[PDB]
Amino acid sequence: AAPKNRRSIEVNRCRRRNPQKLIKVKNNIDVCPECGHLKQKHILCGYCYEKVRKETAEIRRQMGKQEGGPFRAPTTETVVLYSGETPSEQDQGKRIIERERKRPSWFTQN
């Protein structure tokens, strides 16, 4: 089937300016209490999840160094340490990762 006539710009304005083809205004946007950036109500904060992600990457690098090869992985629970910290007895007998950065405020001691 081939179109029988060129459509007028009028008909096209009608079709493609329809309230359905318009982008809806998202009403669930808020600010995150920490960094004060924008985030959607049901989703994690992007900027927070970033610093979390970076730190996870680095701790995984150092614990990649503590492991000798590809298939070799620890049977103990792991506990990560920061400058100035010494292991509690609850946490001893476990694999320990030592890090230069003083323990970040959002990551707790527990």
Partner 1 sequence: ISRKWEKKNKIVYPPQLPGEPRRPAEIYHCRRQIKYSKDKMWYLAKLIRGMSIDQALAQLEFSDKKGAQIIKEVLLEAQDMAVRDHNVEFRSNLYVAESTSGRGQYLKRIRYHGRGRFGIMEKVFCHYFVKLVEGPPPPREAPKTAVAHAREYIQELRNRTITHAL
Partner RNA sequence: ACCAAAGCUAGCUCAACAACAAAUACAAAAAUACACCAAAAUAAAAUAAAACAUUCACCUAACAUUAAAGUAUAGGAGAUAGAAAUUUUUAUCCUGACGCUAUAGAGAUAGUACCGUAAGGGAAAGAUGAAAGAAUAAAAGUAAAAAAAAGCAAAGAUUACCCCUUCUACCUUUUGCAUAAUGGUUUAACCAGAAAAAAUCUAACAAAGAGAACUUUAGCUAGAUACCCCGAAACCAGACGAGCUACCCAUGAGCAGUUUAAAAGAACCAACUCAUCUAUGUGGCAAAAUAGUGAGAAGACUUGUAGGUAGAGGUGAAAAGCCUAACGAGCCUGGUGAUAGCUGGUUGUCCGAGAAAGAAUUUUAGUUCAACCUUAAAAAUACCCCAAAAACCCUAAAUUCCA
Partner RNA sequence: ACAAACUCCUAGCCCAAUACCGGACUAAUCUAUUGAAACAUAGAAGCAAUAAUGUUAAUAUGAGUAACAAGAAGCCUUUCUCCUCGCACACGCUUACAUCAGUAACUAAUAAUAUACUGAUAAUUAACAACCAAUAAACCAAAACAACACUAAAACGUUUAUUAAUUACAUUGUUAACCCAACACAGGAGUGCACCAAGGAAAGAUUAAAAGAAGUAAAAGGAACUCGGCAAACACAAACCCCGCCUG
Partner RNA sequence: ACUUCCAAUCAGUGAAAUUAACCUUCCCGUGAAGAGGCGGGAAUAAAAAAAUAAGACGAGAAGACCCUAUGGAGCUUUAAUUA
Name the site residues for Zn ion (rule: CB under 5 A): 32, 34-35, 45, 47-48
Give CA–CA dist 25/71, Å, rounded: 50
In the chain, % helix, strand, coil (3-state, to 5) comes to 25, 15, 60
Is residue 23 involved in binding partner 1 (CB under 8 A)?
Answer: yes
Q: Tell me which of 22, 84, 86, 105 binds partner 1, using CB under 8 A.
A: 22
Give CA–CA dist 39/31, Å, rounded: 6
Give CA–CA dist 81/97, Å, rounded: 6
User: Which pair of tokens denotes residue 25?
Assistant: 């205004």
Please say which residue, 37 or 60, places its beta carbon nearer to RNA. 60
* 104 closest CA partner among 33, 50, 44, 55: 55
Tell me the binding residues for Zn(2+).
Answer: 32, 35, 45, 48
Tell me the binding residues.
Answer: 32, 35, 45, 48
Among 21-29, 47-55, 72-80, 98-106, the segment contacting partner 1 (CB under 8 A): 21-29
> Least distance from C-beta 39 to RNA, angstroms?
19
Residues that bind partner 1 (CB under 8 A): 16, 21-23, 25-26, 29, 38, 40
